[PDB]
Curated annotation (Swiss-Prot):
One of its GO terms (biological process) is integrin-mediated signaling pathway. SMART domains: Sema (SM00630). The keyword Secreted applies. This is Semaphorin-like protein A39. The keyword Signal applies. Residues 2-379 form the Sema domain. Belongs to the semaphorin family. One of its GO terms (cellular component) is plasma membrane.
Length: 379
């Protein structure tokens, strides 16, 4: 059964991150660490939703801080660099924030009710950048990660757009940009991404077409990186689809841009340029205007690896001990835990009293809940 490490009293789980194999659980007014089977606590200010623990011991923890976003170190001391804006939201709402090589990227508004953008903050990868108006959905993102596209680091983000007039439709995308992007070709555009492209994802089966992304992660294989994307639906089902990043990178490399029929500029939109090389005026104008590939990415096997119940909140993966390239996939709903074996294709489930926020695998599955940190599978 699950070994529960309980909070003194049930908490509002606001965020969960793994850093160097240590689990950081942000709540309202505190952050908890879990490792070596011990749950420890750093209390912080109250009315302070801890949305953010990132690497920049020296772990930066940030929260709404009663409506004035603020960051601390894990020991509760104030952050010497006075980070706040862009590191925690202005209220308890969903955020996407990541750091890679100490570079921080975030969709967190940097002013209250500001325009929703995906930003890189000033740092080791270059000065601050932001997406153009409406490039990112009002809803923000559902996933973000850094991955090499051959030679260069690119940032990939997932999100579901909402469009249409007579009919409101949802559209899932993955978008790519260069981690070290130097921005636009003129002073006015110099802090805008210059390499942003997006491509539609597909996750269909038997007429069911999944659109709302819940959560995602990647898995490295011998020759590829596999992107796992869990979708929800307003119906009674959810769905997990997988994608080849090689396939996705090829599409960004070779697809034409929707609505643009002239030969693409050179160098091409969306590729990374050596430090000191700036995007050309023509490429930037085209990419700003035509940021969507004329393509749609099909999942591996052309359908979901599996369908589950709607309302799945999170999932994670653990590669099977002796069956390599096989996995156990854990996923959760508010009050239930599920696992899918990729080899057998059997799904198991159990109901729990705990209100589950996420599942994160270290050497075992950790289930983070209102009641605390649960170690190991139940049933
Ligand atoms: C948690 O507390 C124990 C002492 O009870 C300590 O050994 C351990 O270092 C602490 N863990 C973290 C990550 O602070």
């Amino acid at each position: 059964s699950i070994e529960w490490h309980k909070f003194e009293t049930s908490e509002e789980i606001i965020s969960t991150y793994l850093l160097d194999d240590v689990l950081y659980t942000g709540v309202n007014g505190a952050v908890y660490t879990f490792s070596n089977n011990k749950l420890n606590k750093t209390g912080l200010t109250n009315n302070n939703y801890i949305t953010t623990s990132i690497k920049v011991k020296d772990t930066l923890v940030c929260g709404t801080n009663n409506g004035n976003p603020k960051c601390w170190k894990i020991d509760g001391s104030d952050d010497p660099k006075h980070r706040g804006r862009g590191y925690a939201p202005y209220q308890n709402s969903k955020v996407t924030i990541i750091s890679y090589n100490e570079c921080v990227l975030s969709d967190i508004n940097i002013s209250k009710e500001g325009i929703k953008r995906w930003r890189r903050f000033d740092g080791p990868c270059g000065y601050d950048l932001y997406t153009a108006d409406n490039v990112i959905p009002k809803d923000g993102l559902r996933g973000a990660f850094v991955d090499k596209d051959g030679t260069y680091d690119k940032v990939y983000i997932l999100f579901t757009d909402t469009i249409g007039s007579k009919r409101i439709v949802k559209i899932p995308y993955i978008a790519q940009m260069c981690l070290n992007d130097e921005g636009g070709p003129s002073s006015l555009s110099s802090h805008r991404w210059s390499t942003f492209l997006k491509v539609e994802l597909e996750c269909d089966i038997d007429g069911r077409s999944y659109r709302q992304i819940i959560h995602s992660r990647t898995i490295k294989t011998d020759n590829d990186t596999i992107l796992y994307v869990f979708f929800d639906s307003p119906y009674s089902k959810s769905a997990l689809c997988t994608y080849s990043m090689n396939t996705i990178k090829q599409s960004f490399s070779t697809s034409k841009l929707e609505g643009y029929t002239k030969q693409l500029p050179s160098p091409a939109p969306g590729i990374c340029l050596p430090a000191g090389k700036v995007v050309s005026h023509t490429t930037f104008e085209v990419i700003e205007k035509y940021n969507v590939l004329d393509d749609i990415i099909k999942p591996l096997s052309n359908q979901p690896i599996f369908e589950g119940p709607s309302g799945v909140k999170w999932f994670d993966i653990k590669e099977k001990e002796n069956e390599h390239r096989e996995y156990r996939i854990y996923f959760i709903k508010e009050n239930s835990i599920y696992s899918f074996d990729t080899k057998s294709k059997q799904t198991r489930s159990s109901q729990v009293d705990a209100r589950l926020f996420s599942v994160m695998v270290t050497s075992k599955p950790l289930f983070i809940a209102d009641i605390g940190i649960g170690v190991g599978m139940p049933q």
